[PDB]
Amino acid sequence: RMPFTPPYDVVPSMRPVVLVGPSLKGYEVTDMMQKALFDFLKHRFEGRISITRVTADISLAKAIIERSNTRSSLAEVQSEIERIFELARTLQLVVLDADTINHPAQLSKTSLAPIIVYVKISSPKVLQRLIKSRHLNVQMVAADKLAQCPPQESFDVILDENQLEDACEHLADYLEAYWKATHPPRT
């Protein structure tokens, strides 16, 4: 009429960190800005962090057998999900360099419960200039889709700082607070 079940979902013991933005992965502007952040985490959280590449399409994670319509099989994706869970088992920070994920809606219906970090260039004109100083339309469209997300519910952390060092310190502070929450006293 008018358009109005298990109580618990099992998720990794440490929520995996996934970076999205400023635009599409696979292209220089995004790949360089994300690489700087990964580089920073590796050394700021040395001994407490595992950063791992995920090439499989983990957007596909959740009587005809369900199969993927792309090159990334549901069986390969399931194996990668299991590997991510195992990485998190001992409560190290897990960061994923996940090739296929450019928008938080892509992980919304999975069991991964990521910490989504939005690496944001708040001005489109600034983004257009960065790109052209180094396919433009697909990149601008991607950044605009991110800019349309309801920010509070879509992202766990938004890094809109012009200065890399300030973005890095903001990310570090958030992850330090998560470390404390979980521990009671491009690549």
Partner: protein
Amino acid sequence: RREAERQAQAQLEKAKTKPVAFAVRTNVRYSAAQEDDVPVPGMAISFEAKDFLHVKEKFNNDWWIGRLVKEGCEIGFIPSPVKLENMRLQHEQRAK
């Protein structure tokens, strides 16, 4: 007798040093009340929908041991799915 509370409190103290077995994200809330008959009164873990819990071990069919993933939160008793469902059933019966 409340020897039972003492044993429950001992199992809780022993779990402080055990590893996290698994984690869950909640799809419902639980707001603990005295009448839920928590193994050690005062030690239930309440939570809201979309909270994360770290679970260490099973206490019995009604209760797990673990903590809310939140700074300053400590180990206590988490309702099992069986217990959540029986509370939901009881409430829907009494509201009717």
